[PDB]
Amino acid sequence: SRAEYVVTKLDDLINWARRSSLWPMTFGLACCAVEMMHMAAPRYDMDRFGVVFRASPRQADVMIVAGTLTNKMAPALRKVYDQMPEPRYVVSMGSCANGGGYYHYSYSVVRGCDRIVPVDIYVPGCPPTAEALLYGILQLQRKIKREQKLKIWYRR
Amino acid sequence: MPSTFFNLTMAFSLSLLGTLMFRSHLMSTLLCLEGMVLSLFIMTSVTSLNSNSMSSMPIPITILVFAACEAAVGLALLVKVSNTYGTDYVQNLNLLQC
Amino acid sequence: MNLYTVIFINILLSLTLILVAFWLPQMNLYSEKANPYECGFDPTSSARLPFSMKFFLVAITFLLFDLEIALLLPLPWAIQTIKTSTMMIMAFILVTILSLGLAYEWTQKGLEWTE
Amino acid sequence: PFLDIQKKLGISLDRHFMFLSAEQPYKNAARCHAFEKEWIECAHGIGGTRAKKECKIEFDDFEECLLRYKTMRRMHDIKKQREKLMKEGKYTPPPHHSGREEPRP
Amino acid sequence: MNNYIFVLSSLFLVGCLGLALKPSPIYGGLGLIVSGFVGCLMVLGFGGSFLGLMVFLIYLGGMLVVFGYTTAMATEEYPETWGSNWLILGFLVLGVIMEVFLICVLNYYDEVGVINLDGLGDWLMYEVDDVGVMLEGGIGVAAMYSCATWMMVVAGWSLFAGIFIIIEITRD
Amino acid sequence: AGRISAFLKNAWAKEPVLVVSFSVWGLAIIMPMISPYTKYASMINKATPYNYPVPVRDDGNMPDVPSHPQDPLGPSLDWLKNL
Amino acid sequence: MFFINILTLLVPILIAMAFLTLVERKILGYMQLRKGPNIVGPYGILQPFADAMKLFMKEPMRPLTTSMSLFIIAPTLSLTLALSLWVPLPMPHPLINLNLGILFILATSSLSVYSILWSGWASNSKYSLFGALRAVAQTISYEVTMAIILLSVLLMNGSYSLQTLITTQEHMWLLLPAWPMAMMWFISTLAETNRAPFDLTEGESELVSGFNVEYAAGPFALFFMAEYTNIILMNALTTIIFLGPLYYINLPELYSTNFMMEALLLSSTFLWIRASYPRFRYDQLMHLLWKNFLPLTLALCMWHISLPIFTAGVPPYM
Amino acid sequence: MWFEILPGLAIMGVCLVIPGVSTAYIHKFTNGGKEKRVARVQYQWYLMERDRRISGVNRYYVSKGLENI
Amino acid sequence: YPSKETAHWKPPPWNDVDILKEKAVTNMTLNFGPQHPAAHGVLRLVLELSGEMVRKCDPHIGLLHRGTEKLIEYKTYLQALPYFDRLDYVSMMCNEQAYSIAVEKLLNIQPPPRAQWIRVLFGEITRILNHIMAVTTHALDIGAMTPFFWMFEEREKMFEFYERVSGARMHAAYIRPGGVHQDLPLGLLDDIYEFSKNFSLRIDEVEEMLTNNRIWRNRTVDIGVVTAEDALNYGFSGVMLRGSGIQWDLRKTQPYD
Amino acid sequence: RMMRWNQERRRLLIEDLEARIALMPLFQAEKDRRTLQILRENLEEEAIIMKDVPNWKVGESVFHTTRWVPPLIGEMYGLRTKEEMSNANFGFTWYT
Ligand SMILES: CCCCCCCCCCCCO[C@@H]1O[C@H](CO)[C@@H](O[C@H]2O[C@H](CO)[C@@H](O)[C@H](O)[C@H]2O)[C@H](O)[C@H]1O
Ligand SMILES: CCCCCCCCCCCCO[C@@H]1O[C@H](CO)[C@@H](O[C@H]2O[C@H](CO)[C@@H](O)[C@H](O)[C@H]2O)[C@H](O)[C@H]1O
Ligand SMILES: CCCCCCCCCCCCO[C@@H]1O[C@H](CO)[C@@H](O[C@H]2O[C@H](CO)[C@@H](O)[C@H](O)[C@H]2O)[C@H](O)[C@H]1O
Ligand SMILES: CCCCCCCCCCCCO[C@@H]1O[C@H](CO)[C@@H](O[C@H]2O[C@H](CO)[C@@H](O)[C@H](O)[C@H]2O)[C@H](O)[C@H]1O
């Protein structure tokens, strides 16, 4: 119907604004965070996609888990994630974050950040190259593009 | 003008009540001494403007000049009261009964 | 009247944007989201405890100098007087004692923050 | 004063802006300059106690110019009597009091 | 617009009522800014200008310092607000009732003397030189540099001495 | 007289803000004393006519008070036009 | 017709504020050897509107420890005073013509410091309280000199009216007889607007975000709109005071166009400065302003008191 | 390149000229093709009030010259 | 005259100096990290604060303890090599060399002449890598963010040399006990030389922005002063030693390769 | 250049003030007449309004002196519309 069509284009409108402004939380754990700094470096310039690092979880949209999550740091990662306003997305980057990686069998490591927070995109690698992370970030925008919140509200 | 002075004068009385009726903080009693300065300044300013007495308009400025000094001297004392007991509560300033 | 209108218009815009910000988004409140922020760990004490002011002496010296601005701001009208010699002499002295007061505090380590 | 030093030295530190009729910047008279100048000249040299009775005419006029108690009273009575007539319906203000005059010049 | 000045003085009154109940000095400093601003608007309504903005300027810097001192010396765990305690909340509400009563009462027994609600606005500006040029309050305040130079000597000395006074008071 | 130059050069090297501040402070107190224009500051302020020049009744013993403003008598502002 | 005149002030300013966020991100980009935004629209021109829309669909935060009345008031005050600073600016004819415009600018600017203080205090968080107590320290630093600098410049102008600066600078910028005060004035405006190397209240490096760390969503958007409006205004004010644009009574369009070019250029230098320097320590900001600028400003105040006297150059009252 | 900054810098420029130009024209459109009269002192305010009274349409900007006497 | 209510009054002190029960000294305790732009990731710096003055520093580490030393025990001497890439994960090939020289000593073997020159070549590329990260991220915390973007373009190019020998931008796993894994690909020394001829201009541009800047000097001069004798007693090494005047450098005093 | 331009502005101000002085007699003549009619027009309405109020003397002064006392704004616009009164109290101060 006309209203169902209008709701669709309003859905694209709000998605587009969230796709075009992803503000990751300044937050990296280990060597994977070095490649996340390279994605911010001139060659890739994530800023040109509208991606701006913000220190405060209140001002951040995306949490990129870029390094190993140990048991000591697990509660703190969850707390800054809880304090992220919604909508909010997690990119798990690297083997350590993806599933433990080189430390999977360590007594002190969380075997994957997805035991602690819900993860949207998994980026393989140890570390993923800055392009691999960039591909993952741009794969998160397409996930948002497929969001259908307003349309589903209409059919409730 | 008649209605304004009554409201201004009652404003001064409320702050005199505030100054004379302490609570805990000494800082709060200092702010009431600034409520009184503000009421007096506004009365003097309105009096001088209404009567067209330009030669009296220096006087409201001196009230502010000599009211800051008290606020400065009052705040300087409040630092010494805090450096002794760690708060500015008036109930602590009672050693001198004996 | 204009100056009252333009500022209500400013206030209403700031209000209107405030209302849209709170009633438009989809809100999901729970205790762990609304706790205070402190870099990922729980605060060890409320933020309302005393916070020592290491520049307090400069703070109250700002008040004294702030009122000495109130004495220099009439100067643009004062240079219109016939008694130019008087206006100038009073102005020079006023600025000079502000400077002499500033020099004394500077040499007394008054501008230095308390450690 | 308690130590008439200013009078002794012949200077004037604060004596020259004591009252309304004092000198003003750019020769701008104060409100009720005429009345006050009369009262201060009436009570000059005869002393305070004599002046309180023998310059009561000058003072009560200055007091009326400054505070205008009788003026507000009088204009309150005229407006309140007109309010009463208009409610009954025995008086309609003139055109020049209802916002329709032929302005001067 | 005939009630304009009456409302500003009524707001000023409350600001000092709230101030007199003495909540946390964070809010007592907020009442002084709003009373300072309200009072600034009164001096403007009566024809002032320089005097209006100065008292607003001076009280903006005073409460800045006062704020710094509150967070360091006059802060407790649960700062009190006007609604924090039922007893203060009672006297703030009751205080507003009284003025609505005192104004209505005193207006009943004189009608003109003190509060003349019947004639608000009629008696704000008494006289005014309609063809004037030199009438700003700044010209009157500026007389300190020529005519009332004594005012400025005591004012300047007050501030000059104060620097010496505070440096000794706060000295270790 | 010899050590001062060493000090002044020293301050000028490492504290020009204060050396500039004292110089400008002291240069502002000399310039009115020696300028040949300081006298006109009062005169120009006195020559600006805010209030109405209220005329005086001509009794008959006023031989140096103009009758008409375009008379060759009275205060003149030629010194100000050609200033 | 006056309401339409508000529209043609508050809307162009708000649009110009938004694109300043884009110009900031691209000038900082190319200065850092990258491109800044250029995907969201042609050369990123839509990037500002995306950020705004996203922030007003973000969930707003109501922390449990927060004082809500001041928490909400503070951002509302911030953006109100940012827009209110504009109504007296003569370009070349102001929307609201005030005799003491300069004091209205000084007084409005000071009152906007309380949005930083109240928000930080109302957040009831340690990092937000650190940010607030730097706002207090920063204001105590620049307030005294900033007012006196204005006094010095206005003794060549004759009044506190902003519209009379147009006439003072009819034949020459005030930048020439006053370049020492312009140098000190310019640095004050960086301190007034919390701009690098003086972004001490925010100061992401030391404080996570300073006073607005607990703010998200639309309330946090209002704080930024206020910050970037002030940048344009303070540089717009500096253009009127010191770089007087060409004014011909027959070509008021000329004054606005020239006024804009210099205001844009000065706004760029704020972005240029942010890319070039490290951040001051807020204790050192006080020492800069009290031990360097203040001694010079008092001397220049005494210089400019005497200067019209011994050249017979007193400005006219009107 | 660096000139790709211009598209945003040019928008910001157009935006900053609308305030000055629109206010100047609106003043002429609401004041009979003349600059909005400025009144700094009481004397100038008196002239406007007198002009408002002698205009005949209760508008200060409708000037009457020698036609009127 | 005693009265029941003042029965508790005491005579004042003989010199007006009233003894007071010792006042509670409480400092503000603040968490500085882990999630903090200056913590370098996983530092929970617990600070005791008086105003903004630091009274005590209490670094809580272990937020990135992953049991590398226990995991190494279940690996061979080759399986364990990549753990050393992830220790100082900004100085990868330098870590591999430290591990390689240890095992070679225990094996009693010598790497061949060319591989020692490859390991010193990449040993010094990694130092330039490490010092860019140290200098610019240090300048980034202080508030100067531009130099970071200039030098991380140079790091992007040095990562290209890591990838052309090993196939990985960071964790090369290239230095191995006994030598290096593969020989340099043809044409790699030209690119290293092309980069090196231009790199000192890059250092010049960063220095033009920091070395003589008065806002950089004020933030760094007289800050964190450490005396020589306390440097040695605290276990410091490297620049923390040579910053204080101590003349020590293992490349000079106990040379390897 | 500031000196030479401020001196020129001082002459321009003197010319502009001399223009006002040349015209104050005409404004002063008009102010008197305008004020006298308005006072006469309130007097012609007090007589109508307060005919039948005992002990009312229409036009009675409140001053023992017989010197001319200029009227207040409240005396002068007090029997007119509130718009006129608001104008006289805030006309100058609110114009911006
Ligand atoms: C009557 C309506 C008119 C307005 C009335 C308010 C006028 C202003 C009064 C300001 C002073 C308030 O007066 C107040 O007195 C009370 C006792 O009653 C004292 O207050 C003390 O006792 C009360 C009662 O337990 C406690 O709630 C309070 O915390 C404590 O400090 C203070 O001294 C003063 O805070
Ligand atoms: C304790 C603090 C003291 C430190 C400060 C000391 C400041 C002293 C300043 C002295 C400067 C006064 O400088 C003095 O200026 C006046 C007027 O300006 C000049 O006076 C001259 O001009 C005036 C008008 O301008 C004429 O009316 C007058 O007839 C003529 O003499 C003097 O020739 C000059 O000597
Ligand atoms: C912070 C709170 C602020 C709220 C302050 C109160 C605001 C309201 C103002 C109340 C003051 C009196 O307000 C209003 O004054 C007018 C004249 O001025 C009174 O008088 C009015 O009516 C009377 C008849 O009764 C007539 O003479 C005439 O129409 C007018 O004078 C009104 O009876 C009263 O309603
Ligand atoms: C020991 C402690 C005290 C020492 C410090 C104080 C010293 C005094 C310095 C202040 C000097 C004020 O000096 C005083 O100025 C006033 C006006 O300003 C002059 O007084 C003048 O006032 C006005 C000027 O328009 C005239 O109408 C009046 O007739 C005339 O006397 C005095 O003649 C002079 O003596």
Ligand SMILES: C/C=C(/C)[C@H](O)[C@H](C)/C=C(C)/C=C/C/C(C)=C/Cc1[nH]c(OC)c(OC)c(=O)c1C
């Ligand atoms: C300022 C804004 C920006 C866009 C900047 O350009 C970039 C993108 C942000 C930076 C620099 C850091 C982003 C996240 C983060 C907290 C990383 C952890 C970290 N940080 C380090 O140093 C800084 C290290 O140093 C050895 C580390 O080991 C680790 C593990």
Ligand code: SF4
């Ligand atoms: S996955 Fe590899 S590169 Fe990433 S943090 Fe773990 S060890 Fe480091």
